[PDB]
């Protein structure tokens, strides 16, 4: 028994959105409510059943306005399904690239950063970590509403470190130094990725370390190189961005501090605005 269990029959697949090295995702319909949902699938695909079922177990435990919400699951018999709310505007990376910059102005970028830090702060308390914090894993809804994809959450008592298998692949340009050199992760590794996410946002979706080949990134980071302040990017935001890339984990701020910072800039920005 489980209140998240849904018979496979309640959902119909409408259109396939995009494939994934972890399971194709679909746009589907939850008949009972005539509700458009997102369906996460997995055949004898990439992941292995037990791992998938554990992700599902973890998703049932989170609830936050800035984390994609789980709606139900089909874990009893294959095919397995993870149903979530549908974000109408897709991922943040593509949104920023094709948007109207007059509408998606400076206060809107600050607002978006505030919503993400909010989700991460919460994830830090409930002892969670996101395996890949990046713009490609942030979804957008109506009115500049941004949420973090929840399928990438893992259990890790906030403060502890995880060691990934050997030979595993990482999204290099978003990975902290401790992970590139020793395959170690912590909520602090997420803080480093957040800094890179802030940069994708300030540049409207530009790729990190332009022209720098993946093989040369770590050596540069070591000798103290860091991406320059983007054009138009407020200095205070760049300082946080820089505090996030401190070479030493325990030197990077917490998401509790980061959310406090953005909260402050977003309000004082809404004031000078309406004024």
């Amino acid at each position: 028994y489980d209140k998240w269990e849904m018979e496979r029959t309640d959902i119909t697949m409408k259109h396939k959105l995009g494939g994934g090295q972890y399971g194709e995702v679909y746009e589907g319909v939850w008949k009972k409510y005539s509700l458009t949902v997102a369906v996460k699938t997995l055949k004898e695909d990439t992941m292995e059943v037990e791992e998938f079922l554990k992700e599902a177990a973890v998703m049932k435990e989170i609830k936050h306005p800035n984390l994609v919400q789980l709606l139900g699951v089909c874990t009893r018999e294959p095919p397995f399904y993870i149903i979530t709310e549908f974000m109408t505007y897709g991922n943040l990376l593509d949104y920023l690239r094709e948007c109207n910059r007059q509408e998606v102005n400076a206060v809107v970028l600050l607002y978006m950063a505030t919503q993400i830090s909010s989700a991460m702060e919460y994830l830090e308390k409930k002892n969670f970590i996101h395996r890949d914090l990046a713009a490609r894993n942030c979804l957008v809804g109506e009115n500049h509403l941004v949420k973090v994809a929840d399928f990438g959450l893992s259990r890790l008592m906030t403060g502890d470190t995880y060691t990934a298998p050997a030979g595993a692949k990482f999204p290099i340009k978003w990975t902290a130094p401790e992970s590139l050199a020793y395959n170690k992760f912590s909520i602090k590794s997420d803080v480093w990725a957040f800094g890179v996410l802030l940069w994708e946002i300030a540049t409207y979706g530009m790729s990190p370390y332009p022209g720098i080949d993946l093989s040369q990134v770590y050596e540069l980071l070591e000798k103290d190189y860091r991406m320059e302040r983007p054009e138009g990017c407020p200095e205070k935001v760049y300082e946080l961005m820089r505090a996030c890339w401190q070479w030493n984990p325990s030197d990077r701020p917490s998401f509790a501090e980061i959310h406090q910072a953005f909260e402050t800039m977003f309000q004082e920005s809404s004031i000078s605005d309406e004024v």
Binding site: F170, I172, S179, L180, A181, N183, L214, Y218
Partner: peptide, 8 residues
């Protein structure tokens, strides 16, 4: 482009 890779 090229995003995922094994550390060096």
């Amino acid at each position: 482009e090229a995003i995922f890779a094994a550390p060096f």
